[PDB]
Design a binder for these strands. Structure first.
Ligand SMILES: [Mn+2]
Ligand SMILES: [Mn+2]
Ligand SMILES: [Mn+2]
Ligand SMILES: [Mn+2]
Ligand SMILES: [Mn+2]
Ligand SMILES: [Mn+2]
Ligand SMILES: [Mn+2]
Ligand SMILES: [Mn+2]
Ligand SMILES: [Mn+2]
Ligand SMILES: [Mn+2]
Ligand SMILES: [Mn+2]
Lengths: 252, 254
DNA sequence: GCCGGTC
DNA sequence: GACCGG
DNA sequence: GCCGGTC
DNA sequence: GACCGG
């Protein structure tokens, strides 16, 4: 991680920050995400990007090459391409006068890049005024496809996927940050990631709870996740028949 | 529907109206047009318009002597409506006039219109027409399935309706404007053609604009035909999952 | 031209 | 994106 | 603690 | 809640 070396500093600047309640179901804690960026672009300016900002810069410094095929080559990693790139029509039609903008389903919120090593940073906000279920972290299926691509291309040293939880509570008319938490996906026991199939097949956890004691290599992390994923997939197929078919057959 | 009679009036008040922007998560973007629909309904169909939580508060305030969740749950007089409109055990019990219900992200309906013992569950979906996107989440197919089971079990086939209003908008300068609307009734559609997106929160998905309204059978028939479709698709999904999330990765396992 | 995954 | 439990 | 539907 | 297509 590139953030980790300064986590304490950004934990300091955030705790207490205030944002105004939205238009008196989704975001609303979003202003914090922007606050993180700003307070990351200041300390690690040359490393910090919005996912879309990175693609723009990358295509921008390659005026010679055009066409989607050539532009995808620019990624130099089947995995990163999968994880970070935009569609066929979007890459083809990119131009300095038609840049990529925020897309709702982008893998990362912040991209920190340094010497070909990418840290995919995802920001999560939490209303701590209440005990809620863990939020969507990332699609279990997307991870499955990443690991497989990592195994196929032996790309075990190209990127990390880290999270930052920012907790806030309502105090008056503003929302105020009261705590933060950092964690790395590839530091946890892949066998213990909870996959909520109904919830868009998302791995679900509270960042403060994600265990950080996995001791094997990156290749072992991916292999063990793929086992865990296939196994949970089979269980879910068994359970759906029990929760969605069995109790309703009497009506057919 | 209690709203179809005045659809033209709602439509004429939304089309063209600008609203100053807040990014625009899309969700945070349409919200204001929803405020407009509610407000409009509140001043024209005032005695029958309510936000789900608002109805619940009104419901309980009217029966102050009724304390404890069971007693308060009895106040619905309908298993189906209870299932679709109720707020959990702990919350129902902890409700007081000093601790009223607020909006819950989970609420089945955005707006609830009711008259003469009949309920209209109204959901208003917003759409950024500046793009062509996948059909949005309409309602959980699982919840619908349970709703049909309860209807059949209790013979409640003429108690409520589930309607959708689509608000189309776009970005024009420094503000959002509304460009068109659409209305449709869930129970007037062909249940067997409802598309269930299992990964997308097991939600029924369709664009309100569109969505057939030809079903000519009864509600009881609508319920059963849906249940058959739900069950069939779930088996189809159990199979797809092996074919898509297991079989293709089996080769990385040990 | 049909289908469905992701934040 | 992030929500508690009839 | 654990599990998992919905907007 | 509502998002397009490497
Ligand atoms: Mn909302
Ligand atoms: Mn090509
Ligand atoms: Mn966003
Ligand atoms: Mn979003
Ligand atoms: Mn994100
Ligand atoms: Mn985020
Ligand atoms: Mn009880
Ligand atoms: Mn709603
Ligand atoms: Mn609402
Ligand atoms: Mn709505
Ligand atoms: Mn607990």
């Amino acid at each position: 991680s590139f953030i980790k070396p300064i986590y304490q500093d950004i934990n300091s600047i955030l705790i207490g920050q205030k944002v105004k309640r939205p238009k008196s179901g989704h975001a609303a804690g979003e202003p914090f995400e922007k606050l993180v960026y700003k307070f990351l672009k200041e300390n690690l300016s040359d490393l910090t990007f919005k996912q879309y900002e990175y693609l723009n810069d990358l295509f921008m410094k390659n005026p010679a090459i055009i066409g989607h095929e050539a532009r995808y080559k620019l990624f130099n990693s089947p995995t990163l391409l999968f994880l970070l790139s935009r569609g066929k029509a979007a890459t083809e039609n990119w131009s300095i006068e038609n840049l990529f903008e925020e897309k709702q389903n982008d893998t990362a919120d912040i991209l920190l890049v340094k010497d070909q090593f990418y840290e995919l940073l995802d920001v999560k906000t939490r209303n701590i005024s209440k005990s809620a279920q863990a939020p969507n972290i990332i699609s279990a299926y997307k991870l499955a496809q990443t690991c497989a691509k990592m195994i196929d291309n032996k790309e075990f040293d190209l990127f990390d996927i880290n999270y930052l939880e920012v907790d806030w509570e309502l105090n008056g008319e503003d929302l105020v940050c009261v705590s933060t938490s950092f964690a790395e996906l590839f530091k946890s026991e892949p066998s213990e990631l909870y996959i909520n199939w109904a919830a868009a097949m998302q791995i679900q956890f509270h960042v403060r709870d994600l265990d950080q004691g996995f001791n094997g290599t990156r290749e072992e992390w991916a292999k063990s996740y793929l086992k865990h994923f296939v196994t949970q997939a089979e269980q879910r197929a068994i359970s759906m028949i029990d929760k969605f078919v069995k109790p309703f057959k009497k009506y057919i």
